[PDB]
Amino acid sequence: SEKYFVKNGQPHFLISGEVHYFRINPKLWRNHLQLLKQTGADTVSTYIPWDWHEIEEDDFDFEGKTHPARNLIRFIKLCKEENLDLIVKPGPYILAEYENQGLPSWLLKKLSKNAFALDENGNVISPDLVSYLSDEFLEYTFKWYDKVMPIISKHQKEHYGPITMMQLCNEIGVFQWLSGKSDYNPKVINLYKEFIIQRYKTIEKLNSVYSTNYNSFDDLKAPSGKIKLRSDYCAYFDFHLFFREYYNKYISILKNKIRSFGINIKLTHNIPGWIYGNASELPMLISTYSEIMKNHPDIIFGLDHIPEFVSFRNAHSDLACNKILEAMQPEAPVWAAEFQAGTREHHVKAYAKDLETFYIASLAHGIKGFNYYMFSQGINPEGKGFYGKTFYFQTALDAASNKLALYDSIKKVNRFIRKEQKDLLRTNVNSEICVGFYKPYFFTELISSQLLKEKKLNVEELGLYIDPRFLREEILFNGLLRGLQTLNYNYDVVDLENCDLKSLTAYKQLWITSAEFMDAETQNLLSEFVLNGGNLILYPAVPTLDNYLNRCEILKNNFGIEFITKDSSHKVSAFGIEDVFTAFSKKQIYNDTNSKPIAFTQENEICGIRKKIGKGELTILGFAFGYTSDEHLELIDKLVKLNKIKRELFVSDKDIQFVVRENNKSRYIFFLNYHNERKTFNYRKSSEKSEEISIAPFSYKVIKENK
Amino acid sequence: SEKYFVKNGQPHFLISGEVHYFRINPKLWRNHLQLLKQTGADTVSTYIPWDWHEIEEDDFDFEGKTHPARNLIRFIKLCKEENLDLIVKPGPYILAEYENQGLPSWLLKKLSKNAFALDENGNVISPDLVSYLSDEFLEYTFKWYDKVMPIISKHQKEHYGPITMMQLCNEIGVFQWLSGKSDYNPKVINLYKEFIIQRYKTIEKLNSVYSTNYNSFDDLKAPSGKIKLRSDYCAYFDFHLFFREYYNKYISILKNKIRSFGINIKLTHNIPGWIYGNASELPMLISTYSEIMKNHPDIIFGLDHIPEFVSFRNAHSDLACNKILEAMQPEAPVWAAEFQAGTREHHVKAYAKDLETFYIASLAHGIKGFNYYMFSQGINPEGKGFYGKTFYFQTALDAASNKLALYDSIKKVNRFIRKEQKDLLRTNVNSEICVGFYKPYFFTELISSQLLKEKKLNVEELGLYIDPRFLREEILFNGLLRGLQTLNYNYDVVDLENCDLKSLTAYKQLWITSAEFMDAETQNLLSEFVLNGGNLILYPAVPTLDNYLNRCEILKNNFGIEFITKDSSHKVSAFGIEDVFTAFSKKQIYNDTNSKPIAFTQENEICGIRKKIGKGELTILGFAFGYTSDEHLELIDKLVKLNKIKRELFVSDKDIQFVVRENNKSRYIFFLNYHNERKTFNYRKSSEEISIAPFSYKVIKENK
Ligand SMILES: CO[C@@H]1O[C@H](CO)[C@@H](O)[C@H](O)[C@H]1O
Ligand SMILES: CO[C@@H]1O[C@H](CO)[C@@H](O)[C@H](O)[C@H]1O
């Protein structure tokens, strides 16, 4: 049932370390590789920077002719000699705190303006930010691939070389996201027009969906400026759908090019989204890859985990992220393409004692492989550092190959993994709770995000009150998911798109955080779920619109719900819990028809009901809550207990996090203390003296049981 | 030298605990007060909520006639019996997560529209947000004072009673901050017009400053919307000055009313600005009280410190805030009116072991007193909480007076403070570095802040490239102040407004973080400073404009500086440090006649010089750096060493922070470990081997 890497037909935990040959004295390459191997790591990972190897236009060095550390060929040979497999990452973008994100200076000086990402005014957004489908950009990228790809092809595992995997480019859209502006390049605009014409066929059909009055497709322009009408929302929704096809076109072109060199190894891509040590926006960025993941079953996405510290302030980010990757990529192992080791920034410390706990928590949280980023510190040669001379701090090795404090933490974690990987990789958590991932709520990177310079989406101007970004960040990511993890209830996340009823009916409960809009397909799937025997928890709104904000009352009518939206105090009572603070004055007030009222406004109006519908159960709460008070954890606990869901352990300290993982042979108990307190507690299995445990601040214990 | 509270004619560390009688079972009031006194606390602090006591219009309950927890009189008698002094805070605003921010529901229902703060369209901003100078609001505020102030007068220290201090209202302007919305109430706008007429006298004078085309003051509208033109920046700048006068008018009306009751005790106000565990915006909030602090030497401002956690991620916030308060309030002790104890937010943990370190670091960082907020948890009466039933978590005591983990930390820190206060309170750090506080850069709460989401200020539309909030947050607060503290170099901050030349001449170096604009008085002050023998460090720009963005090149011409602004790579070299990352492509390239070039672009153009001017020295860098690389610490260290400034100790571990505090007799060395690492290190001056746990401290005393 588990998805894991396999080596020689056996479960294999992928343990990689990032070692940048181009930032290490080549006389010390072998020492870095040997010391990585000695931690039990099986793989090494590096970028191959285009700027580093195409030293001038059409002048290539991969053999150290012009600089010893340009000898890629010798680095590849050393990996094979030191029995490490190799992950190569030739870009064209590498980011990697490298000048111009890895693109050659000579290229950026030569490209015309139309090669660059442009704002709504036609101005260059950033001097190192290209437009991905720029003709000029792809012509130069292809000429770079013509030189680096024959080397990668020759050194593949199938030809007895060390190369097992290759990353295509780096965090597609990360540069656009961090710039705070979207790409209005004329290639984007023209491709968008073709997309719209293919989608709608006639202007009359587009006008009927948008409620616009265009005479022809020629009158329609890519949406710019703030959303003031539902028709602007519709245009931006289609723009989001278009950018997912656009990123799929980019990675398809790179992949087709690469395959033409006889490169048959596993292709990877890496998911950005952590910033300031939390990952609440990563679900938005992963959502931009929806069409790539649908179209390329042979590209494995891995996470870029950058926690920076390990405390209750960010404990939920890594689990939520691992769960959402699983939902969008159910057929591949969850793994971290970049797994924080040291710090990319001197002023943002990375303590070995934090990261060691992160590594263990990641195993508890179901990670199946990772690449320590950065295992080895680098020193940038020849002024190539974006931000300074030194690349990373507080790593496993310094640039000179000296062991630092983190080395012994990685050796300890890797030792446990190698001893246990045969069983541990095959273990599952018993999740009786499924949480719905409704991708369209995440499609706002053009209009609403933590990074976007201009807020383009104000839902109040559309006569709505439930902002999809507020819902998915505060009600879902920081709310329900944070709540369930804190309460030690296992959950899975399932992508609702083309979702199998069969793959929902194994859960005791399905939880749906709903806005006022939801497509007909999803409204029909949730209806069938309940009619057929499913138990559904749905808040803060019964939706009544589709993704284009047109009438769609399928779920409301199938559930026999009548409601009015009324203004009241933020506080409600729910299941006998008084003074539950809710996010909105407006709430859904339900008729008590064929239902039990279980939530009341300050005027005792019904804002939550429970009902039996066909063979199923429905609980609706017409109010929004995340986790910003103790009442919210009480409410989540009450809702879970409606279907008699029990934690796996009784633990005497509610602030201790645990995960039980098991298969037929083995049970692993992970205890995680995310708090600055030495905690002494006792526990027992919820079905039969209690064991006592002492756990340091920001620390962990792992217990293995045979059977 | 030092400013400190006094008790029995000796230095007194003010140790207060916040205990909300109105949120606590009255049967347990005496228990709470006894457990607070048993920590060594000398004072207890509480709101007196207007909503809680004026239960209906003109119906007052201070004796528990209608609810036992409305017996304020009995709470005051218990403070007296348990030998605690009392800080009272009657509002009218209390915030304190209290419904309507403490204003009666009956008041908010009955006020006219024109009593409320209005957006530019004349719409009510928030149904609990009144206009501070609303006639109706002040009428009802005065009637609340008429009942609560005679009780406070009767029990005040000037009549021997337990009440030693009173806070006026609560965090004035905190609602214009949190929303970014200014009050456009017609009475406010009429006051803004009076301010402008009074300031410029004639429309011709104002037109010449703003470059506007008005025929009269009748044509003048309050600024709104985004700044597109230099004339809009000018109008918004005076709108900022106006709000500083407005808040001084409000707090003066409250103060005159209070004094009319014969209340002669110390009056207080509290400074907001921490959010998400850092305080980089608090300097903006303190700048809103510039006119109050100028005109009321008798009102003591205290800080509201909410660190949430204690690490290198926020180590610099509390010191920078304490140093800025000292700059703006040199004649009163630096203290925390609200000093984090527990957490306002269940999901935002406050570890006893973090706050214990924060408490000791605060002593290192010059705090002279504090009020643990919240010492006691509260239970909101009858749904009167803004949020849920419970007020604060992980406090010293829960609402039922159960001791929690923080209690023992507070008792430990208080025992240390009581043992040392006599000598500790009279100690200062030896600062050879002075950092200038130029308040106009901070006057942006209406146009540019962490809490305004739609920014009205885009300096590129004005032909500028150095944004004053970016400068004061990233180059000053998180850059230079963070770097000096990390390097363990003492600094003082000085308010440049009406600044005495003599109070700059004690320092070996004055550091000025400058945008492209600076008023004639500050340009003149800095010119004189260097000519008379001062050492000035100035970056990232020689200013060429005044606060109205009109030409002003006093400093530039007095120092014989010429430059062109040119685009280059972000990285420069400076004092032989290669690859210094700078904020801007645009840099000042200096004519090097009679100068030494000390910084270079990637094309080797001169973006920094040193120069002798009269008896003094000038170091100008035409590029902006904060602290985002090891080269930035190397550059700060090189700059400090230009005038041979030394740290007080050699400590073997660079990541240990220390503060040396001395007077003639006593030295305290505070070692602070802001890192998740047990650190062993040794130290010696400029048995010497020491171990400190993660996120922990050690204090060493040396007799001199
Ligand atoms: C500039 O580097 C990028 O920064 C983002 C914001 O922290 C991260 O989400 C990405 O994983 C990282 O590659
Ligand atoms: C709403 O409560 C206020 O919140 C601000 C934002 O965190 C703080 O700066 C203030 O001190 C606090 O009183």
Ligand SMILES: [Ca+2]
């Ligand atoms: Ca000159």
